[PDB]
Design a protein around this ligand. Structure first.
Ligand SMILES: [Mg+2]
Ligand SMILES: [Mg+2]
Ligand SMILES: [Mg+2]
Ligand SMILES: [Mg+2]
Ligand SMILES: [Mg+2]
Ligand SMILES: [Mg+2]
Ligand SMILES: [Mg+2]
Ligand SMILES: [Mg+2]
Ligand SMILES: [Mg+2]
Ligand SMILES: [Zn+2]
Lengths: 86, 97, 135, 220, 99
RNA sequence: UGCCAGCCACCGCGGUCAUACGAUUAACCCAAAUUAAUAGAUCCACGGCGUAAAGAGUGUUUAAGAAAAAAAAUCACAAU
């Protein structure tokens, strides 16, 4: 969300976010189901599915997002461009 | 076991292909008449396909035959020989309007 | 609220899932109806790529043996005298009559084209139809 | 309240409940020219499974499949009507514009045949009003807009989680359409046919709902 | 019961073959000043101009004789992925339904 | 104090209202240690080569390799 005032953009991006929601399927409600590797534009994310105790070892943004999803155990290495939106 | 289903034949209806005025004629440098048809009367230029309307093959045969005639001394270069002025006009150009 | 991603799944998918997550607290009408008699294909978004290389479509062109006959008919006699009525569901044209006659004389075993064709023309002249032909 | 759950649940258990099987046939569709599509030069890639083939350059839709689908679309339409929900006929084609507006008004259903304002579905509360109900179903009699791109309402109905019935001609893109029925949108007997069918389905459903309501009232 | 294939195979529109130079019957469903909108039963209507001879005999509902050229007017143009439809058919108006 | 005096690993700070200099007050962080300097450990491409560094002006063979399933050498036109 984007605005002249910081406060304003905060509001805008919140209220807009709630409109695009995904459902993320969680295996046993902690990990993902299986290993994932994706090249999105110039960013490569590579994630691996962990056992119960191995908490959230990830780029800090991914940890943030995971904590929001409910994914508690994960390993992800991002390579190529680390640009945040991508 | 449905007999009403379509049969994978080639198109029966398909038309024949259109033909250059000359398809399977023989262009020969020796007859300046046929050649002199595809020239501009005033200049002596050779007309293009978009005027003569020929298979690329024949437009080529015509060009080569023309130039050959012109240098072996059968046919004049700078103007269409006046004798052949009143022969049939095959080409699509209109000068006088 | 809901999910405005058109590309991610079917509306069914997104809806059911958003209910599953406990976000969407009221089931929408069309949902129960949907579950009951779902469509043939999942309405998931798809991008229409242009084909390339040697690839072509699978679509079959529609031809029947009768066509193989009709062509000779039209080459010979042009379109028939009776015109055409594309409103009348049972309408038979002059070409179609000629076809049926040709097929019947095929069942007598004459394998020559000329015999079949000309004799079907005669069998048609019998019924009173005029074939004016063309040069 | 329990028997209201009865009145909503009951019709789901039969396949035919409004008996719409008998409103059309493959021959019925065939005479309305529905099986006729555009030239093969215009054919949209995603339509090929619905083509019976191509006759001399024309694409002939496969009616067996048109029937299969149409049965489903009508069924769905009807059940939405019975459940008292908003149906929106949408077409931007100026021949049938009047025809469709008429049809809709006769079913007690709504029509948008005109220019589709930008945020109509996505930003509803600004265009229409402070709080609003949005259509529960949207029927497209033509999936295209007069510039030959897909009608906006398709992308935005999808965007809004609204299920969509629509008649997809041979050059349309069916992908985002919930229950597509392949067939001819251009010719008059076809559009008149589809209008009449959706009309009858709606009316029949609203009746059945009235009658079953009456029955529920005499039950106690 | 009749399979769709069976219907398609016998229909008058299949009987015609190629639609070039075919004599057909058509009916006028709409009029603007000199423009007759003629439904000949195929897919798209054609549109022809009201002739000079017996101009007033052509009215909505009338029947006329057409010479069909093209069932749909369509072409691909430079730089386009798909063809362009005019959404019309090409016909020559001959006379009206001599009867 | 005033583009001076000075500061910084990198971005940078100092021109009269400096949280960046110098000192004070408060705080933070390590702790019998704490900073600085220098050497290591670690770190480059199983990635790339139209426009960013990069397909070498052209073809043939040598060496070396690949053969991994199905076939082919060949006819209007301005090669030399
Ligand atoms: Mg169409
Ligand atoms: Mg210092
Ligand atoms: Mg100061
Ligand atoms: Mg500092
Ligand atoms: Mg200091
Ligand atoms: Mg020490
Ligand atoms: Mg370069
Ligand atoms: Mg090179
Ligand atoms: Mg060089
Ligand atoms: Zn030729």
């Amino acid at each position: 969300g984007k605005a002249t005032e910081r406060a304003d953009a905060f509001r805008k991006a919140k209220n807009r976010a709630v409109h695009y929601l995904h459902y993320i399927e969680r295996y046993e409600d902690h990990t993902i189901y299986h290993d994932i590797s994706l090249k999105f534009k110039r960013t490569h994310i590579k994630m691996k599915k962990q056992p119960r105790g191995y908490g959230l070892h990830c780029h800090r943004a991914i940890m943030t997002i995971c904590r929001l999803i409910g994914i508690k155990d994960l390993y992800a290495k991002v390579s190529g461009s680390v640009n945040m939106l991508n | 076991s449905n007999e009403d289903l379509p049969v994978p034949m080639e198109n029966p209806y398909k038309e024949p292909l259109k033909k250059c005025i000359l398809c399977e004629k023989h262009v020969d440098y020796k007859n300046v008449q046929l050649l002199s048809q595809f020239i501009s009367p005033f200049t002596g230029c050779i007309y293009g396909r978009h005027i003569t309307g020929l298979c690329g093959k024949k437009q080529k045969e015509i060009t080569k035959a023309i130039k050959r005639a012109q240098i072996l001394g059968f046919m004049p270069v700078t103007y269409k020989d006046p004798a052949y002025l009143k022969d049939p006009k095959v080409c699509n150009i209109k000068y006088r309007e | 609220a809901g999910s405005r991603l058109e590309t991610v799944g079917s509306i069914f998918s997104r809806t059911r899932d958003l209910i599953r997550a406990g976000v969407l607290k009221e089931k929408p009408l069309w949902l129960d109806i949907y579950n009951a008699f779902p469509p043939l294909r999942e309405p998931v978004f798809r991008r229409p790529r242009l084909r390339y290389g040697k690839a072509k479509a699978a679509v079959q062109d529609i031809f029947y043996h009768e066509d193989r006959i009709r062509a000779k008919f039209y080459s010979a006699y042009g379109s028939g005298p009776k015109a055409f009525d594309l409103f009348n569901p049972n309408f038979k044209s002059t070409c179609q009559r000629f076809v049926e006659k040709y097929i019947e004389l095929q069942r007598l075993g004459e394998t020559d084209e000329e015999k079949l064709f000309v004799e079907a023309g005669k069998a048609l002249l019998a019924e009173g139809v005029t074939l004016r032909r063309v040069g | 309240n329990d028997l209201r759950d009865r009145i909503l649940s009951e019709p789901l258990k039969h396949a035919d409940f409004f008996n719409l099987k008998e409103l059309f046939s493959v021959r019925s569709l065939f005479d309305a020219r529905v099986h006729l599509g555009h030239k093969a030069g215009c054919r949209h890639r995603f339509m090929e499974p619905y083509l019976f083939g191509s006759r001399l350059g024309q694409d002939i839709i496969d009616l067996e499949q048109t029937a299969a689908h149409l049965q489903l679309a009508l069924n769905f339409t009807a059940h939405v009507a019975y459940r008292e929900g908003i149906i929106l006929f949408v077409s931007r084609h100026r021949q049938f514009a009047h025809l469709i507006e008429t049809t809709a008004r006769d079913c007690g259903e709504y029509a948008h045949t005109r220019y589709f304002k930008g945020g109509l579905l996505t930003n509803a509360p600004l265009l229409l009003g402070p709080g609003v109900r949005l259509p529960d179903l949207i029927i497209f009699l033509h999936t295209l807009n007069n510039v030959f791109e897909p009608h906006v309402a398709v992308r935005d109905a999808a965007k809004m989680n609204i299920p969509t019935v629509g008649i997809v001609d041979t050059n349309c893109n069916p992908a985002l359409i919930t229950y597509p029925v392949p067939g001819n949108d251009d010719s008059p007997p076809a559009v008149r046919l589809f209008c009449r069918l959706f009309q009858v389905a709606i009316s029949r459903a609203k009746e059945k709902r009235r009658q079953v309501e009456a029955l529920y009232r005499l039950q106690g | 019961v009749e399979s769709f294939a069976s219907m398609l195979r016998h229909s008058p529109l299949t009987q015609m073959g190629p639609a070039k130079n075919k004599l057909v019957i058509g009916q006028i469903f709409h009029i603007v000043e000199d423009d007759l909108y003629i439904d000949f039963g195929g897919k798209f209507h054609c549109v022809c101009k009201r002739p000079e001879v017996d101009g007033e005999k052509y009215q909505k509902g009338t029947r006329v004789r057409l010479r069909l050229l093209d069932l749909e007017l369509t072409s691909r143009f430079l730089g386009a992925t798909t063809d362009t439809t005019i959404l019309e058919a090409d016909a020559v108006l001959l006379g009206l339904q001599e009867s």
